[PDB]
Design a protein around this ligand. Structure first.
Ligand SMILES: CCCCCCCCCCCCCCCCCC(=O)OC[C@H](COP(=O)([O-])OCC(O)COP(=O)([O-])OC[C@@H](COC(=O)CCCCCCCCCCCCCCCCC)OC(=O)CCCCCCCCCCCCCCCCC)OC(=O)CCCCCCCCCCCCCCCCC
Ligand SMILES: CCCCCCCCCCCCCCCCCC(=O)OC[C@H](COP(=O)([O-])OCC[N+](C)(C)C)OC(=O)CCCCCCCCCCCCCCCCC
Ligand SMILES: CCCCCCCCCCCCCCCCCC(=O)OC[C@H](COP(=O)(O)OCCN)OC(=O)CCCCCCCCCCCCCCCCC
Ligand SMILES: NC(=O)C1=CN([C@@H]2O[C@H](COP(=O)(O)OP(=O)(O)OC[C@H]3O[C@@H](n4cnc5c(N)ncnc54)[C@H](OP(=O)(O)O)[C@@H]3O)[C@@H](O)[C@H]2O)C=CC1
Ligand SMILES: CCCCCCCCCCCCCC(=O)SCCNC(=O)CCNC(=O)[C@@H](O)C(C)(C)COP(=O)(O)O
Ligand code: SF4
Ligand code: SF4
Ligand code: SF4
Ligand SMILES: [Zn+2]
Lengths: 115, 136, 312, 205, 186, 89, 169, 91, 90, 182
């Protein structure tokens, strides 16, 4: 319908798209300093592929306040990665390196367990 | 003699009461302080309980452990009847404490058996609540 | 962020001991939510139980008796001595004085022995409850507390003879960390950090609670606002807490220890074994607890570190 | 008399009633409803757009010198249209009193930060950012303060579960503290302590 | 006497409020205490005096500290003097256990009596608070005097019903004495 | 060792083919030797004259809550708290 | 076609893939102190496997393996390869036995035959007599009957020992 | 009676302390007895069985919903300025 | 207005900064149907797998009181519980 | 379960001795390695150095073994600030999600031999904050634990019981005899 709300850092969709592209540029610059410093077993190209996948799973949203909240949270993770402010255990959390993958076919899900 | 020569006399009395110089050396090696006091009790397991009100509160009542153990003493060797007397809960020793019960099902005292082959390990106390078929 | 030894930008990072306490309080009964407040503030405990109990009693519109009020006041000032001994020993370890740590923790262990005598636990007492106290004090606690309060003035005299007059302690405390009073008011300071900066504000005197207005004492006020003025203010709160302990040992009435709303306070064991409605009220107070009427309150006390508030 | 029943203060009731009517007269735009709860505490329910001037008024008026802001508390009520509510508790040393200023905030609607008025909020709204997830505009430093660095979601929101979504352990093939899906060894036994019979007849109206 | 910078009100005490005296006697006194270390020698004298004091140490484990009859330690399940276990499976203690350590499962026993078949206490989830001691209507669960029960293994700190019954059998005399000397306080 | 195959008073024992008996190769199983059933049927029933009797655990305030048992029905009437048996001739 | 031996509801697989659940495997991991054993223990404890870990030395060498499993899924045992009674106590309630026992150098108590051949025969024979379903003993890649020495005299005794051990297992 | 040093070392300690010394360490003569007679807690104001009813003692039901002050003034109405309380000088 | 000192961060700001502050002080038009799944921090598996039941809770048939009936509530679908092999909890 | 023996049975039994490995081992090299292990464990169970860690309230009890009633320096136990100069880390307090890599790094930088005392219910199994989001369910799942002090605040008597049981564990710890039988 229609609703009049206070905006968050952007009025229309174009400014929110510009802020998302600024996040992508800043994360691209921050990845080679993440790789050489954090002592993680991830190559720079794997880090950029993971950054692309993190943006791809949030391409589907359309609301500008949701997009700008995602921009604010991504800027917080960027600020927690410019200053080190973290350990190597939390950087690898995006890759989910400890969770063993689960099958998607119904026969293997039937054999393994009810989930 | 106003400087503590009577305390040296008390030390010599402690040495003669300990059973000799070798026995006082053994008591000072086992118990890290050498002290005198009236013998209050002797618990079934062979420990001895002394109490002297001359000392600081907390050192008034102490235990000399059983002579058959050495370098294995711990705080779990004190039985349940002398536990409140050693921890200053009651001023009444179990010799004249007629209120403490004695039932047929009260087990004897046991120490902490962790780190030992006879330790405790938990289990489910309820049996199985879902029964299978049993085709035969 | 340091240029040399001097700081340029000091940024505190917290949440390292974040336990999800308030969300957990949202899932428990008020009786179950009472031992949380022993684990909010670590070295003053009966103050936090007092603050949460005043929050629940203001929501329930019930009143504590005079004996429970004097017990709460006496143990609140005993709790104050414990926090200040903790603060003095911690500041002495941080500055470098190893000795008054142990010299005052002997007395602090005497007060935790007193805590174990009155409640059964040395530190986390669970003693002050909504509707009075849980248990009456045992017989003979008066002589022990009185002997301790007689000797503690001389113990503080020895600790002040070592620490207060020394040139190294003065050079390590004075003209250091000076906070102005308008910065103290604008940044929401409370307690000694208000009182060390010259601001006359003590929550035990302005908004009195739990029989602080039947006892008399002095409010210590600093002048400069540095570490030395706050240390002297803590020692003067220690001595005035000894004065309030003296007055509470001097006068207490004989009577009940808890309120007589049996739907709020749990019943005793004699009316448990004899009466029937007390068994019903026990069962519904220890299964689902009492029903607090709906509404909001904020009750604030004077903890030794500052104003301790509960918005319930 | 009645020794069990708590006796209130009549003069504090009269003073807070007069001051609440004074506040409702002074700001007809931002003050929405002034109420006086039991226990002699004044709650000034305000509009969201009046979050910053009213506190400034309560900082700077001659009969409203609420110099201390002791805490800001957030309450998550999911049934309302605007979900969160934000409670500012202010202490006045000159007149020796306290006030509560309550506002409402959506999950996406901003609040104007009170850091220009009271600097203690410089961390306090940060806690309301971390626990609930409301954005505070014109904040000098808005970051998560109490939770983990890689934490996702806001905990004291009522949509968040009690035990969280994830757990942490130590893993030797990665030599790191790793993040796993949450499995309790014993689940949280939820107790049904809802009252089946109503007790207070004055609160159903 | 040194003068006061700010006049004190009634009922308040001002610290660091005395002006330093500018007369020659006080300046010479503070100068002699400066160059000859007067307060340092006083602190050394106080410290050398407390060398000659008696230590407050107690010879653990031969000497143990003072306690109270109300002391909260290891949970234990009491029995009646007839020999029957006191617990009647009413689940008040688990309903009031604020960290949810106790787990109780029950059924009707073969003689028709209401009894437990599983009484578990997570001793790593306990906080030793005595709410189960106050909640218990038949005085079954108590806090025993034992606190020397440190284990080498995490599983030994999860008490079964049989371990609590063995603790109730072992610590029966001191628990009976404590509940004799404590019950009219509660 | 016979404590592995011993049965507790709740009728629980681990099977010989069960994997959960591998936890008892280094720590012994705790089975309480004092079963409550045997020690409550060892106590003889109490003969009473009155139509109703009261039970309080035999300790006063340290027993169970006081309950009243009717004895007009013939047989042994069991107190539901402590298990003491009353009878009227 | 493939029978299920246990037929006990406590013994079947239950829950999800986390550590607190049970995957129905009761695994005994021989040589869990070493380099492969830590990763094997961690991969077993990720799936919630109840593991019996027998150690031949000190408790401090295997105290680091309590991290991999949950409460009750790690059970330590004391064994020796010259004593079959401790191995019989170790594998008496095991469905899976993993043999990672090996040594790259000669020892004054255990030769290459005593650790790769004869100790493997003791473990495999005791596991076959105890009713263990599976046995996952390792080997080397270049095992041969007569491996010719490339540089040193007396070399390739390890490869021959692993070969003789793998055919005798 | 009480364990201490000989009075020469006591006088040395009293000289070095700068004050007369009272013993910090507790003793059995200075404390109360560990076994005490069994106490009787007295009843409060409403354990009388005759006069009291709960309806006159129910503090939980005497609370009310909060009062809208503008609405209260509108219902009840159809100099110095209002202060939140008494003026306290913290200066 | 007042003849006092003006605010320096508003007078000296660029016209693009005055337009930026006035646009954020206004009200924008948004749809009222807003999806907040990526913001709430829930994992995506619980988003695509769990089903939510909105219901009025059932009255206890042994009790005549209807105060706990007087609300609606959201509850989530019951997944698998199991017995841990150590000690027997759920 | 066995109980403590009756004093007649205790008089029938001989003295245990200091050595937990026995008097004789029927070999000269085994006896020499056992006595070297006895000397080494006497040097190691004497003066274990705990670590200044102090996460929470249980730490305040940790100063009550510093405080002169209990005196941990009587036993050789003395605090050191650096983890390199420490044998023991007393994990005592609530271990949260932000302190998981902190505790793992401080434990890993501490040199072998390593014994960890878990003091308090939060460090044992989470305790009163077990069902929360941020608290790690005990410190076992990150670092190994040798001693579990069970009280929520332990008495300092009960903490020194855990310290003395750790000293008895070090006294029974055998490495040279294991080397001879490996
Ligand atoms: C400023 C400086 C002032 C200096 C003053 C110097 C003169 C005064 C002086 O030395 O007084 C201390 C002391 C007696 O005065 P005190 O301090 O009142 O007595 C201690 C307590 O009051 C005793 O109180 P108690 O009733 O509890 O006594 C129980 C017992 C408590 O017993 C123990 O503590 C036993 C463990 C320690 C002794 C172990 C055996 C040692 C011998 C083998 O006390 C003693 O045994 C006290 C005597 C200690 C003798 C020396 C101990 C070993 C010293 C080794 C280095 C030299 O005198 C001496 O030690 C020397 C006396 C003259 C020389 C002859 C002996 C050589
Ligand atoms: C049995 C022995 C028992 C005692 C043993 C211990 C001995 C005493 C302590 C030894 C050293 C202890 C550790 C180091 C402590 C250092 C303290 C220190 O210096 O603090 C800095 C403080 C600083 O002074 P302050 O504390 O006043 O600081 C304010 C002043 N400003 C900031 C300007 C410095 O003290 C001093 O520096 C004092 C001077 C020390 C040197 C002595 C100078 C003597 C000058 C000659 C005197 C002449 C008299 C007149 C003669 C006339 C002839 C005609
Ligand atoms: C004379 C000075 C040297 C004495 C050396 C004695 C060595 C043997 C001995 O008795 O050691 C004592 C103890 C182990 O012996 P234990 O069984 O505890 O006691 C014997 C009881 N009759 O051993 C110890 O407590 C430590 C032994 C250290 C041995 C160092 C290496 C020797 C080779
Ligand atoms: N690169 C490699 O590691 C390769 C390994 N392999 C094989 O893989 C297996 C495991 O390898 P890896 O982990 O690297 O080897 P390790 O040496 O690191 O570990 C061997 C394990 O066996 C134990 N062990 C050694 N000797 C004996 C003995 N006499 N009696 C009982 N237990 C003993 C060790 O215990 P403790 O440490 O306590 O003494 C340790 O737990 C071995 O069979 C090896 O031959 C094959 C090819 C390559
Ligand atoms: C090395 C570690 C790597 C860390 C990776 C994690 C970085 C954080 C990832 C995020 O910030 S997720 C939020 C990103 N924000 C958005 O996606 C906003 C919505 N996105 C869009 O609308 C997109 O369509 C773009 C991004 C505009 C793409 O559209 P194009 O076509 O016009
Ligand atoms: S003492 Fe408290 S935490 Fe422990 S079992 Fe009892 S009720 Fe639960
Ligand atoms: S409260 Fe007492 S009788 Fe009731 S279940 Fe618990 S232990 Fe048993
Ligand atoms: S175990 Fe108890 S005393 Fe220790 S940190 Fe946790 S709550 Fe505090
Ligand atoms: Zn009965």
């Amino acid at each position: 319908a229609v609703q009049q709300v206070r905006p968050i850092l952007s009025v229309d969709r174009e400014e929110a798209r510009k802020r998302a592209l600024n996040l992508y540029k800043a994360w691209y610059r921050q990845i080679p300093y993440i790789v050489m410093d954090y002592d993680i077993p991830m190559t720079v190209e794997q880090c950029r592929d993971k950054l692309r996948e993190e943006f791809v799973k949030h391409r589907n949203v359309t609301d500008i306040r949701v997009i700008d909240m995602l921009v604010i949270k991504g800027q917080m993770e960027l600020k927690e990665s410019v200053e080190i402010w973290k350990q190597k255990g939390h950087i690898m959390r995006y890759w989910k390196e400890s969770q063993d993958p689960k099958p998607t076919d119904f026969l293997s899900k039937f054999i393994q367990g009810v989930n | 003699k106003f400087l503590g020569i009577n305390r040296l006399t008390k030390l010599f009395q402690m040495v003669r009461e300990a059973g000799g110089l070798k026995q006082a050396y053994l008591k000072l090696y086992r118990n890290d302080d050498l002290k005198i006091g009236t013998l209050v009790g002797i618990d079934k397991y062979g420990n001895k309980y002394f109490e002297n009100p001359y000392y600081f509160y907390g050192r008034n009542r102490w235990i000399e452990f059983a002579p058959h153990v050495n370098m294995d003493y711990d705080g779990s060797m004190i039985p349940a009847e002398w536990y409140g007397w050693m921890h200053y809960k009651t001023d009444l020793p179990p010799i004249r404490d007629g209120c403490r019960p004695k039932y047929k099902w009260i087990a004897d005292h046991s120490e902490n058996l962790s780190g030992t082959k006879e330790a405790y390990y938990p289990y489910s106390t309820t049996p199985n609540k879902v029964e299978a078929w049993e085709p035969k | 962020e340091l240029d040399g030894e001097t700081v340029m930008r000091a940024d505190p990072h917290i949440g390292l001991l974040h336990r999800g306490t308030e969300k957990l309080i949202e899932y428990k009964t008020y009786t179950q939510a009472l031992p949380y407040f022993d684990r909010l503030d670590y070295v003053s405990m009966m103050c936090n139980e007092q603050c949460y109990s005043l929050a629940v009693e203001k929501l329930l519109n019930i009143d504590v008796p005079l004996r429970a009020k004097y017990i709460r006041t006496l143990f609140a000032e005993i709790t104050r001595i414990l926090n200040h001994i903790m603060a003095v020993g911690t500041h002495a370890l941080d500055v470098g004085a190893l000795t008054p740590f142990f010299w005052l923790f002997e007395e602090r262990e005497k007060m935790m022995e007193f805590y174990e005598r009155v409640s059964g636990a040395r530190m986390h007492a669970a003693y002050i409850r909504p509707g009075g106290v849980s248990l009456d004090m045992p017989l003979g606690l008066m002589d022990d507390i009185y002997e301790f309060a007689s000797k503690f003035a001389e113990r503080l005299d020895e600790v002040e003879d070592v620490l207060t007059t020394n040139r190294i302690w003065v050079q390590r405390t004075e003209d250091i960390g000076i906070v102005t009073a308008e910065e103290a008011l604008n940044y929401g300071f409370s307690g000694v950090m208000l009182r060390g900066s010259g601001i006359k504000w003590d929550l035990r005197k302005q908004q009195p609670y739990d029989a602080y207005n039947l006892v008399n004492f002095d409010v210590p006020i600093g002048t400069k606002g540095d570490c030395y003025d706050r240390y002297l203010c803590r020692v003067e709160e220690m001595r005035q807490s000894l004065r309030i302990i003296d007055q509470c040992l001097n006068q207490m009435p004989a009577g009940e220890i808890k309120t007589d709303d049996a739907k709020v306070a749990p019943p005793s064991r004699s009316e448990m074994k004899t009466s029937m409605e007390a068994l019903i009220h026990h069962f519904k107070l220890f299964t689902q607890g009492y029903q607090v009427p709906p509404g909001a309150t904020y009750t604030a006390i004077e903890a030794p570190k500052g104003e301790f508030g509960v918005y319930l | 008399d009645k020794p069990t029943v708590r006796q209130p203060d009549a003069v504090a009731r009269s003073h807070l009633s007069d001051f609440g009517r004074y506040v409702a007269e002074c700001l007809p735009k931002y003050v929405q409803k002034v109420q006086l709860t039991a226990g002699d505490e004044l709650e000034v329910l305000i509009a969201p757009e009046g979050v910053v001037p009213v506190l400034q008024f309560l900082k700077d008026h001659h009969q409203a010198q609420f110099t201390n802001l002791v805490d800001i508390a957030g309450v998550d009520v999911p049934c309302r249209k605007n979900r969160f509510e934000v409670v500012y508790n202010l202490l006045s040393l000159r007149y020796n009193s306290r006030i509560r200023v309550k506002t409402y905030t959506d999950e996406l609607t901003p609040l104007d930060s009170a850091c220009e008025v009271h600097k203690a909020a410089n961390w306090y709204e940060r806690e309301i950012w971390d626990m609930y997830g409301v954005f505070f505009a014109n904040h000098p430093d808005l970051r998560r303060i109490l939770t983990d660095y890689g934490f996702e979601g806001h905990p004291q929101r009522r949509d968040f579960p009690l035990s969280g979504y994830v757990e942490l352990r130590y893993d030797d093939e990665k030599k790191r503290v790793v993040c796993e899906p949450l499995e309790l060894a014993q689940e949280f036994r939820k107790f049904d302590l809802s009252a089946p019979w109503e007790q207070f007849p004055n609160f159903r109206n | 006497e040194p003068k006061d910078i700010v006049e004190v009100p009634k009922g308040y005490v001002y610290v660091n409020n005395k002006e330093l005296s500018m007369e020659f006697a006080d300046i010479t006194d503070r100068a002699a205490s400066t160059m000859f270390f007067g307060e340092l020698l006083r602190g050394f004298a106080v410290t050398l005096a407390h060398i000659f004091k008696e230590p407050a140490t107690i010879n653990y484990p031969f000497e143990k500290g003072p306690l109270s009859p109300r002391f909260r330690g290891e949970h234990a399940l009491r029995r009646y003097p007839s020999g029957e276990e006191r617990c009647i499976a009413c689940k008040l203690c688990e309903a009031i256990c604020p960290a949810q350590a106790i787990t109780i499962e029950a059924e009707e026993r073969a003689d028709g009596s209401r009894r437990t078949t599983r009484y578990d206490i997570d001793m790593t989830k306990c906080i030793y608070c005595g709410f189960c001691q106050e909640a218990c209507p038949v005085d079954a669960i108590v806090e025993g005097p034992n606190f020397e029960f440190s284990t080498e293994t995490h599983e030994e700190l999860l008490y079964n019903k049989e371990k609590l019954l063995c603790n109730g059998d072992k610590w029966e005399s001191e628990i009976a004495s404590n509940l004799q000397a404590d019950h009219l306080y509660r | 060792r016979g404590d592995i195959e011993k049965v507790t008073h709740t009728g629980q024992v681990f099977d010989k083919e069960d994997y959960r008996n591998a936890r008892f190769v280094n720590a012994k199983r705790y089975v309480n030797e004092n079963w409550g059933i045997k020690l409550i049927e060892e106590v003889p029933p109490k003969e009473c004259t009155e139509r109703v009797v009261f039970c309080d655990g035999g300790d006063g305030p340290l027993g169970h809550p006081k309950v009243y048992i009717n004895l007009d029905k013939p047989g042994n009437h069991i107190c539901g708290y402590c298990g003491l048996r009353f009878v009227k001739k | 076609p493939r029978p299920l031996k246990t037929t006990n509801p406590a013994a079947m697989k239950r829950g999800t893939g986390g550590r607190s659940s049970f995957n129905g495997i009761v695994a005994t991991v021989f040589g869990a102190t070493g380099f492969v054993g830590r990763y094997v223990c961690n991969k077993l404890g990720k799936s919630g496997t109840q593991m019996i870990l027998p150690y031949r030395g000190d408790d401090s060498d295997v105290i680091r393996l309590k991290v991999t499993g949950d409460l009750g899924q790690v059970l330590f045992h004391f064994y020796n390869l010259e004593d079959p009674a401790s191995i019989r106590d170790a594998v008496k309630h095991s469905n899976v036995v993993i043999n990672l026992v090996g040594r790259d150098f000669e020892t004054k108590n255990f030769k290459f035959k005593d650790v790769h051949v004869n100790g493997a025969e003791r473990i495999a024979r005791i596991a076959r007599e105890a009713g263990v379903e599976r046995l996952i003993h390792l080997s080397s890649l270049n095992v041969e009957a007569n491996p010719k020495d490339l540089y040193v005299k007396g070399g390739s005794e390890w490869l021959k020992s692993k070969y003789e051990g793998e055919l005798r297992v | 009676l009480r364990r201490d040093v000989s009075p020469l070392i006591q006088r040395i300690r009293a000289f070095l302390l700068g004050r007369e010394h009272n013993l910090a360490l507790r003793f059995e003569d200075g404390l109360a007895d560990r076994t005490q007679p069994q106490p009787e807690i007295p009843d409060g104001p409403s354990h009388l069985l005759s006069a009291n009813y709960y309806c006159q003692r129910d503090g939980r039901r005497e609370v009310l919903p909060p009062i809208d002050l503008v609405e209260q003034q509108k219902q009840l109405a159809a100099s110095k300025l209002p202060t939140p309380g008494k003026v306290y000088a913290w200066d | 207005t007042d003849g006092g000192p003006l605010d320096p961060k508003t007078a000296l700001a660029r016209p693009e900064e005055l337009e930026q502050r006035n646009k954020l002080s206004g009200k924008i038009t948004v749809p009222t149907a807003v999806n907040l799944s990526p913001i709430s921090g829930v994992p995506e598996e619980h988003i695509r797998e769990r089903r939510v039941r909105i219901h009025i809770p059932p009255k206890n048939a042994m009790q005549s009181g209807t105060d706990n009936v007087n609300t609606w509530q959201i509850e989530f679908d019951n997944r698998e519980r199991w017995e841990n092999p150590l000690m027997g909890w759920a | 379960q066995q109980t403590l023996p009756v004093a007649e049975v205790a008089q029938n039994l001989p003295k245990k001795g200091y050595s937990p490995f026995g008097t004789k081992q029927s070999s000269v090299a085994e006896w020499s390695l056992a006595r070297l292990d006895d000397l080494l464990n006497w040097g190691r169970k004497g003066s274990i150095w705990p670590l200044t860690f102090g996460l929470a309230c249980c730490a305040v009890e940790m100063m009550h073994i510093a405080a002169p009633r209990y005196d941990m320096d009587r036993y050789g136990v003395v605090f050191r600030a650096s983890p390199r100069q420490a044998d023991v880390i007393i994990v005592a307090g609530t271990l949260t999600n932000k302190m998981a890599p902190a505790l793992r790094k401080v434990y890993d930088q501490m040199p072998e031999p390593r014994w960890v005392i878990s003091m308090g219910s939060c460090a044992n199994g989470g305790g009163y904050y077990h069902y929360s989001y941020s608290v790690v369910r005990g410190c076992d799942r990150i670092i190994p634990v040798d001693i579990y002090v069970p009280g929520c605040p332990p008495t300092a008597e009960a903490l020194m019981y855990g310290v003395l049981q750790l000293q008895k564990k070090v006294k029974r710890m055998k490495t040279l005899q294991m080397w001879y039988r490996k």
